[PDB]
Amino acid sequence: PGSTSSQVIFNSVEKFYIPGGDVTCHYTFTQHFIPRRKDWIGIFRVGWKTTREYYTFMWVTLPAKQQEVQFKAYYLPKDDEYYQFCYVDEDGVVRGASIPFQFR
Amino acid sequence: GPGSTSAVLLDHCHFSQVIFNSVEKFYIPGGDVTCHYTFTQHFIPRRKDWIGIFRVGWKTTREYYTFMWVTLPAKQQEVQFKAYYLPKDDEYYQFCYVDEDGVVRGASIPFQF
Amino acid sequence: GSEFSLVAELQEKLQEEKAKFLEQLEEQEKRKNEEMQNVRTSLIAEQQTNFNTVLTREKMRKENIINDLSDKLKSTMQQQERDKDLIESLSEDRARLLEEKKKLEEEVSKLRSS
Amino acid sequence: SLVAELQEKLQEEKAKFLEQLEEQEKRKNEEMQNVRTSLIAEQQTNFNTVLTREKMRKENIINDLSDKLKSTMQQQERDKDLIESLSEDRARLLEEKKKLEEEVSKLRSS
Known part of the structure; x- marks a missing residue:
């Protein structure tokens, strides 16, 4: 659910993920940020401009401060570009973004 | 995935060697949709043949809305398009049977959701 | 003593030996019926383990x-x-x-x- | 001599008694094996009915x-x-x- 228009922090983020294996993304919230039903984590190609450019996404898990979603291998890009996790608010605002990674 | 960016030529198209005998004119507005089709023995089916939902007016087989692989056990067969495979707008759509060569072997009469 | 007294003794020994044999048969039957029942019991021991193991393995599976x-x-x-x-x-x-x-x-x- | 005859019949009856004991030990052991074998077979049959009954539950x-x-x-x-x-x-x-x-x-x- 994108548009054409650091409260969340990603941790444990690897630089290379195994191609065709499930990927588990880990994150916590910060500065009394509280989540909502329709916040999502997307996988984005580095250099994207609009939240419409997610490769794939998943709605967040609502509630140990740690949080995680499980991206099944078939949600995952199969090329060699740089990618990055991004937590998007209910109102399209980016509230976090991870370090770049590849599937290789 | 299936489908190609080639323009389909009119005489590389066979619209009737797969028949969509279920096709309603106003497909039942909600819920799943069962796609009933009948072969006419004009070609040998193959496992990576597929059925797509196409907006009436499409130029290439890359333009499917969604698709499902063909199922193999020969005359009557079925696929169930779950509701989340279906368009939500008012355009006219069509089932098309495409084979592993990207050749169109059947295209249904148009309908809406 | 006499030839006649020997015949009399010998006849008693025949009956004595037949009786002793009769009682050996009785003791042999009592002993075999005991060991029969130890056999019936040893078998129920085995069968209790065999049946209950096979059934419990099917439950668990x-x-x-x-x-x-x-x-x-x-x-x-x-x-x-x-x-x-x-x-x-x-x-x-x-x-x-x-x-x-x-x-x-x-x-x-x-x-x-x- | 009747004494002679009974002296011999004594020894042949003692020997015969010995062999009837031995022959009776052998038949009793064969009866137990027979009973044992029959029990195993009939229980094992019944176990089978029970297991099949339990398969369906x-x-x-x-x-x-x-x-x-x-x-x-x-x-x-x-x-x-x-x-x-x-x-x-x-x-x-x-x-x-x-x-x-x-x-x-x-x-x-x-």
């Missing part, structure tokens, strides 16, 4: 099948709920991209033909 | 769970084939749409 089918079902179906939302999003956005690309291609060719 | 739930799981897994494989194709095709459409926007821009400012 089917319990494990049920459990794993239910864990599989549950996880597969919480996955479908996630896949459903993705496919609705993807199929819809892709159809718009297809339309936007057609409009841009129409704008390009109008600009090349000027 | 949960057959209806295994067959139910199994057929739901077959069908939601077949729907999962379709959904994974669809998601992989839609995801990949969008990514291409995004690149193609960006390069077309650059082509339009350059042509407008040519």
Whole structure:
């Protein structure tokens, strides 16, 4: 659910993920940020401009401060570009973004 | 995935060697949709043949809305398009049977959701 | 003493030997009926283990099948709920991209033909 | 001599008694083996009825769970084939749409 228009922090983020294996993304919230039903984590190609450019996404898990979603291998890009996790608010605002990674 | 960016030529198209005998004119507005089709023995089916939902007016087989692989056990067969495979707008759509060569072997009469 | 007294003795020994034999048979039957019942009991020991092991292994096997089918079902179906939302999003956005690309291609060719 | 005859019949009857004991020990052991073998066979038959009875007490739930799981897994494989194709095709459409926007821009400012 994108548009054409650091409260969340990603941790444990690897630089290379195994191609065709499930990927588990880990994150916590910060500065009394509280989540909502329709916040999502997307996988984005580095250099994207609009939240419409997610490769794939998943709605967040609502509630140990740690949080995680499980991206099944078939949600995952199969090329060699740089990618990055991004937590998007209910109102399209980016509230976090991870370090770049590849599937290789 | 299936489908190609080639323009389909009119005489590389066979619209009737797969028949969509279920096709309603106003497909039942909600819920799943069962796609009933009948072969006419004009070609040998193959496992990576597929059925797509196409907006009436499409130029290439890359333009499917969604698709499902063909199922193999020969005359009557079925696929169930779950509701989340279906368009939500008012355009006219069509089932098309495409084979592993990207050749169109059947295209249904148009309908809406 | 006499020849006659020997015959008399010998006749008694025959009956004595027949009686002793009769009682050996009785003791042999009592001893075999005891060992028969130890055999019946040793066998029930074995059979109690064999039957109950085989039955309990069948219980456990089917319990494990049920459990794993239910864990599989549950996880597969919480996955479908996630896949459903993705496919609705993807199929819809892709159809718009297809339309936007057609409009841009129409704008390009109008600009090349000027 | 009658004494002679009874002296001999004594020794032959003692020997005969000995062999009837031995012959009776052997038949009794064969009877026990026979009984043992019969018991094993009849119990093992009955065990079989019981196990078959128990096989069915949960057959209806295994067959139910199994057929739901077959069908939601077949729907999962379709959904994974669809998601992989839609995801990949969008990514291409995004690149193609960006390069077309650059082509339009350059042509407008040519």
